[PDB]
Amino acid sequence: PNNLDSNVSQIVLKKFLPGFMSDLVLAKTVDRQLLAGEINSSTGDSVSFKRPH
């Protein structure tokens, strides 16, 4: 009987399978444009808006 398996090597191909993933729906729908760029270096770490009368 032949024994060949030291002739060859155990190969890990360079490819990845797919992972799982998740949906981002809250981010898209909350308010975006109102707080954009408002907290910056002149502001310190918070800022405020006005409640109605």
């Binding site: 032949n2 024994n3 030291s6 002739n7």
Partner: protein, 53 residues
């Protein structure tokens, strides 16, 4: 490595042939070899000329 048969006419039927068996040799990584030096900025300014030498 192989072995041979000697017959008058070359008729090899019935007898044993050479199996094929593979061996292999392995080699491994060692430790690092490292030299490390340190010196002050003061010394580079006023002391170490020819640091490459």
């Amino acid at each position: 490595q192989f072995s041979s048969l000697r017959t008058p006419t070359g008729d090899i039927s019935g007898q044993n042939k050479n199996n094929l068996i593979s061996g292999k040799a392995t080699g491994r990584v060692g430790n690092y070899i490292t030299v490390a030096v340190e010196y002050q900025q003061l010394e580079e300014a006023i002391k170490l000329n020819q640091l490459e030498e």
